[PDB]
Amino acid sequence: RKEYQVIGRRLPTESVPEPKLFRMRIFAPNDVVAKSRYWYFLQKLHKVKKASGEIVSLNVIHEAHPTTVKNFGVWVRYDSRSGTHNMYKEIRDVTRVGAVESLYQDMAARHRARFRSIHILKVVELEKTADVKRQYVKQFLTKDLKFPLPHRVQKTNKVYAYKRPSTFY
């Protein structure tokens, strides 16, 4: 998981020099996958392909403040067995790359949606506790939050034990 920038162009053909340039914020494991997914989404917009064009720039976009908790709001299009549906989930994560990673896990768990059948439309960091709609996120945005962790368990590297252990905490 990184958060690449892919600036394409199209070829400098005779008659029309200087093409318009096009930018996208692609998520991918490495540099080779980022260029593949660029041409995929560009092919659903303009008359271009890998033969008729070229990549100008490839830049990694690191997080500004990666040691701070943020409330993201992600829009998604995904394809089910029957058809295709639109959605709007909300995530409480430390980075954009971390938030998008956890979304692909949640879509695969509930809806059985794989990597190939998920279009990330737009990711937005929200400002105020009010814009957030979902209750499962709003639990953790309250005044003076405290809770215990009942039923702790140990993990012995050894097999046998001579105490009859407790679950106190």
Binding site: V32, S36, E54, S57
Partner: protein
């Protein structure tokens, strides 16, 4: 019988002249590679200041590796593998990149993994697993007297001079590459970094174009 004893003193003196010629040429080729890397890195910084994007030159050389074994291979891709000298599983070559040679790689892309090497992986392959084709017969490249005897007509008077032609892609790449016997590589020490080997690099598997990550895969196999 007599005077051949005196030739022992003579013949050694002429090889002392050749070692000086190798040393000065190796110093010159070191100055070419260091200036090549610095010129590209600074050229990006030149363009970035003037609100412009430097696009790098496309790869002039590519290295291929046979992934799939033998049998159950259709006749058209089997013929192309025969031309690129990848008859056995795990085999190297080097290919001079053109439009024509790129179409051959499209036909055989499920059965091979390939990418752009550097002056480091190429240096290890020619020393550790380097072998020359000398009147048929897979003969090793132990001494540089062997390379001068065969490839003395196109320059190439050393092992590093042969490496220079492969990396830079000179006028005698076709002769110099064909001289080398295909590199019989071992299986990778760490692994393939996958559960399954036949799915294409970008989806999950191993085959197809990987650009920068071929250097890591070869050094484990080397």
């Amino acid at each position: 019988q007599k005077t051949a004893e005196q030739v022992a003193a003579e013949r050694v003196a002429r090889k002392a002249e050749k070692r000086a010629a190798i040393l000065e040429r190796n110093a010159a080729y070191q100055k070419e590679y260091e200036t090549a890397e610095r010129a590209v890195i600074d050229a990006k910084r030149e363009a970035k200041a003037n609100s412009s994007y430097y696009v790098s030159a496309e790869a002039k050389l590519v290295f291929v590796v046979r992934i799939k074994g033998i049998n159950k291979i259709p006749p058209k891709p089997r013929k192309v593998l025969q031309l690129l000298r990848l008859n056995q599983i795990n085999s190297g070559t080097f290919v001079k990149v053109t439009k024509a040679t790129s179409e051959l790689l499209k036909l055989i892309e499920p059965y091979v993994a390939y990418g752009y090497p550097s002056y480091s992986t190429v240096r290890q392959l020619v020393y550790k697993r380097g072998y020359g084709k000398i009147n048929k017969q897979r003969i090793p490249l132990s001494d540089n007297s062997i390379v001068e005897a065969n490839l003395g007509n196109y320059g190439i008077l050393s092992v590093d001079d042969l490496i220079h032609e492969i990396v830079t892609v000179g006028p005698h790449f076709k002769q110099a590459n064909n001289f080398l016997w295909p590199f019989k590589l071992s299986n990778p020490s760490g692994g393939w970094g996958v559960p399954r080997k036949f799915k294409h690099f970008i989806q999950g598997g191993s085959f197809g174009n990987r650009e920068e990550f071929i250097n890591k895969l070869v050094k484990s196999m080397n």
